[PDB]
Design goal:
45 residues; part of a larger assembly; Spike protein S2' (chains A, B); 44% helix; 2 chains
Chain lengths: 45, 45
């Protein structure tokens, strides 16, 4: 997301292809979720 | 981290020095992560 910028939509550019744009904030928050998932077993016990 | 970019490693640079690069996202996420730990702390209490 730092190396690219969002403009227009996918129906304008001629020849646009599909692919996944890596967002650095997604795994950082998901890694927090996995560490927060450990509290689910503490609630059961 | 916003004013610099990561390229290569420390072994390929001649004259590189060691320092601490301040991440502006580090204290904002950690302070809010403590809000996530204390919230799920009430979930287990």
């Amino acid at each position: 997301t730092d190396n690219t910028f969002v403009s227009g939509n996918c129906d304008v550019v001629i020849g646009i292809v599909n692919n996944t744009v890596y967002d650095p904030l997604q795994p950082e928050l998901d890694s927090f979720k996995e560490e927060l998932d450990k509290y689910f077993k503490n609630h059961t016990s």
